[PDB]
């Protein structure tokens, strides 16, 4: 189903794409959201995915938090993918801008191993403040399932590919 990806490893693929447009096109089994512990989808990938669901993701998420409380940094939950995917795997990477431990990025990527194939952003990149080059490295060294990474920024995509070891 996924097209135009560059193969980085046996199981990691990358594309310069808007993950919302990619999800609407592919309708993958799992789209990963760059979530926070409260599932407050305000900005970045979460804000964009939520806006694409006409706020249905946020309504569902508020019910999930009311029942279960917040997620842990490094944790995840599976909720509906709405009009974007069969499921959305909300994964909380550490937010460096809130002083969270970058070592939790590996724990965050381990959630991907519970799903055979996923469309995902780089965890903790963007407004979460971590180095995206380091996020890709942790992704490659942690995820064993098939992960299709969508990198929004062209300049960052080129830098990630050209510096990939
Ligand atoms: C989230 C990621 N962007 C970044 O980490 C940089 C922050 C500004 C643009 C590059 C991306 O494009 O997928």
UniProtKB/Swiss-Prot annotation:
Residues 1-165 form the Macro domain. Inhibited in vitro by GRL-0617. It is a multi-pass membrane protein. It catalyses: Thiol-dependent hydrolysis of ester, thioester, amide, peptide and isopeptide bonds formed by the C-terminal Gly of ubiquitin (a 76-residue protein attached to proteins as an intracellular targeting signal). It is found in: Host endoplasmic reticulum membrane. Responsible for the cleavages located at the N-terminus of the replicase polyprotein. Participates together with nsp4 in the assembly of virally-induced cytoplasmic double-membrane vesicles necessary for viral replication. Antagonizes innate immune induction of type I interferon by blocking the phosphorylation, dimerization and subsequent nuclear translocation of host IRF3. Also prevents host NF-kappa-B signaling. In addition, PL-PRO possesses a deubiquitinating/deISGylating activity and processes both 'Lys-48'- and 'Lys-63'-linked polyubiquitin chains from cellular substrates. May form homohexamers. Interacts with N protein. This is Papain-like protease nsp3. It comes from Severe acute respiratory syndrome coronavirus 2 (2019-nCoV).
């Amino acid at each position: 189903s996924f097209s135009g990806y560059l193969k980085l490893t046996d199981n990691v693929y990358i594309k310069n794409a808007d993950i919302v447009e990619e999800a609407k096109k592919v309708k993958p089994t799992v789209v990963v959201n760059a979530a926070n512990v409260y599932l407050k989808h305000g900005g970045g990938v979460a804000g964009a995915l939520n806006k694409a669901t006409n706020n249905a993701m946020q309504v569902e998420s508020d019910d999930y938090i009311a029942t279960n409380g917040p997620l842990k940094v490094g944790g995840s939950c599976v909720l509906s993918g709405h009009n974007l995917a069969k499921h959305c795997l909300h994964v909380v990477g550490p937010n460096v801008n809130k002083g969270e431990d970058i070592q939790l990025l590996k724990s965050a990527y381990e959630n991907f191993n519970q799903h055979e194939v996923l469309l995902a952003p780089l965890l903790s990149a963007g407004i979460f403040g971590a180095d995206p080059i380091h996020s890709l490295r942790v992704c490659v060294d942690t995820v064993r399932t098939n992960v299709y990474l969508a990198v929004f920024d062209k300049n960052l995509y080129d830098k990630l590919v050209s510096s990939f070891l």
